[PDB]
């Protein structure tokens, strides 16, 4: 019976783009292929690969349909995220979706995170109500000057509203993705690490969505809307609460080992 329907589908209301309309390779070009707008990138023992948006943004809906690799994927991260780390090295902002690979038999973990001026430790993790290796699913980051919302097939899984300037991303961000070896922490905090006998490790992305406002855009520009009612509807919130009740496996604000004073938005 799945999650309760969100009752509105932002992803379907925004034009699907091919990779080359929004993005170019950043690194590992030899581990990147594009076929009719669809992106394939992969990790082996010599290199991963990653890409970067052509434009730099001040707000928007940023979406892609992604398919993950099954089998042994421990230590491997497939990412889709906003960042300004190349603009503010060592003290940057970030809004992350990271798929954390796994040993055979166990599910992927989807981690969301927010970094402001170097300060992260704002992770929430869920498992999914479908197999993310079998088919492509929609995943999206919505970012405006009042909120961040993270979506899976238009189901909101997390909302991060602007509570104070110190705890919210207020500088321009680029979109990135990558497949890379994060063995030290990706899978059960590094309990299980990359094994290249199972290489390559492939990430697949298509139907890119950019309902967004570049830094250069006219001040009339509005990001794509995520509800016909201005705010999350009753159905959207119920779908989100169902996800958090039934699929959330980690929330920073509820971890007794974390000092929530350091993350005052909790």
Contact footprint for ligand BGC (CB under 6 A): 77, 79, 81, 94, 96, 98, 178
For residue 232, what are the CA distances in angstroms to 93, 97, 151, 163, 226? Answer: 25, 20, 12, 17, 7
* Total residues at interface with Zn ion (CB under 5 A): 2
| Nearest one of 115, 102, 40 to 73, comparing CA atoms | 102
220 versus 257: smaller Cβ distance to Zn ion? 257
Nearest distance in Å: CB 119, Zn ion:
15
Q: Which does 32 bind (CB under 5 to 8 A by kind): ligand BGC, Zn ion, none?
A: none
94 binds, among ligand BGC, Zn ion, none (CB under 5 to 8 A by kind): ligand BGC
DSSP symbols for 47-86: --EEEEESS-EEEEEEEEEEE---S--TTEEEEEEEE-TT
Nearest to 200 by CA among 13, 48, 25: 48
Binding-site string for Zn ion from residue 246 to residue 265, where x marks contact by CB under 5 A and - marks none? -------------x-x----
3 or 80: CB nearest ligand BGC: 80
Q: Which residues pair with 126 in a beta bridge?
A: 110, 248
Nearer CB in complex with ligand BGC: 81/174: 81
Contact letters (x/-) for Zn ion, 207-246, by CB under 5 A?
----------------------------------------
CB of 102 to ligand BGC, least distance (A): 16
Is 254 marked within a binding site?
A: no
Query: What is the smallest separation between the CB atom of 26 and Zn ion, expressed in angstroms?
Result: 38
Q: Which one, of 54, 51, 53, 56, lies nearest residue 25 by Cα?
A: 51
Q: Please give the Cα distance from 115 to 113 (Å, whole number).
A: 7
* Distances from the Cα of 110 to the Cα of 104, 139, 234, 245, angstroms: 17, 10, 24, 15
Decide whether 83 or 236 has the Cβ nearer to ligand BGC: 83
Annotated binding-site residue numbers for Zn(2+) = 259, 261
């Amino acid at each position: 019976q799945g999650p309760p329907s969100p009752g509105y589908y932002p992803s379907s209301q925004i034009t699907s783009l091919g990779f080359d309309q929004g993005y170019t390779n950043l690194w590992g070009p030899q581990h990147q292929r594009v076929d009719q707008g669809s992106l394939t990138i992969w990790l082996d023992s010599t290199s991963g690969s990653g890409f970067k948006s052509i434009n730099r943004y001040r707000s928007g809906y940023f979406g892609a349909n992604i398919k993950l690799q099954s089998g042994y994927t421990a230590g491997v991260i497939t990412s889709f995220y906003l960042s300004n780390n190349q603009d503010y090295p060592g003290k940057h902002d970030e809004i992350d979706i990271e798929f954390l690979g796994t040993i055979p038999g166990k599910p992927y973990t989807l981690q969301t995170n927010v970094f402001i001026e170097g300060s992260g430790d704002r992770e929430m993790r869920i498992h999914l109500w479908f197999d993310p290796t079998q088919d492509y699913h929609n995943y999206a980051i919505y970012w405006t000057p009042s909120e961040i919302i993270f979506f899976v097939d238009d189901v909101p899984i997390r909302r991060y509203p602007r509570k104070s300037d110190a705890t919210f991303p207020l500088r321009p961000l680029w979109v990135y993705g990558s497949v890379w070896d994060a063995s030290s922490w990706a899978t059960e905090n590094g309990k299980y690490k990359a094994d290249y006998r199972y290489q390559p490790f492939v990430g697949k992305y298509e139907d890119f969505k950019l309902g967004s406002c570049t830094v250069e855009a006219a001040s009339s520009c509005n990001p794509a809307s995520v509800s016909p009612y201005g705010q999350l509807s009753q159905q959207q919130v119920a779908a989100m609460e169902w996800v958090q009740k039934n699929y959330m496996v980690y929330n920073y604000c509820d971890d007794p080992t974390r000092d929530h004073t350091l993350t005052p938005e909790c």
